[PDB]
């Protein structure tokens with residue numbers, strides 16, 4: 333409808349795949365080469381389905397901060413025959429608050445879904461499903477099961493991936509440029 337949705341659509345149409353694990357179907361953001369991200373609660377194994385194609389996992393790393401606290405981001409390298417558009421220049425360098433964010437989802441259940449979530453708070457610490465978690469962003473939208481892995485954008489920035497909710501608020505794990513230096 334506007335430039336927020338325009339930037340979100342541009343990311344969804346080139347930089348997302350549908351990932352399926354034994355824990356369900358997830359929006360999965362491709363960042364560069366064969367490297368993508370997914371919430372750590374997806375429990376990625378040796379094999380994953382990418383757009384319903386059996387795909388070997390070449391590497392999978394559940395990120396933690398230097399306090400050894402969960403970040404809820406898993407970085408996956410996929411045995412895929414095609415590279416993602418490199419979007420690392422749209423990643424923030426620092427933890428921040430944001431205005432006017434969009435959460436975008438693409439699964440079998442929720443295709444071509446875009447949610448204007450509004451103001452995004454650097455919330456920081458969250459007890460997420462019983463697990464102490466750092467670098468959490470919060471937005472005031474009643475997100476539901478099926479939205480995990482959803483991409484959070486502003487105009488010009490890819491800032492996080494949806495990892496949970498409490499029925500009234502939704503929570504995303506930050507994406508930082510420093511996670512994807514090679």
Ligand SMILES: C[C@H]1CCCN(S(C)(=O)=O)[C@@H]1CO
Pocket residue numbers: 379386
């Ligand atoms: C292609 C296989 C990879 C290993 C796991 N299995 S399975 C029966 O779902 O456990 C996949 C079958 O589609």
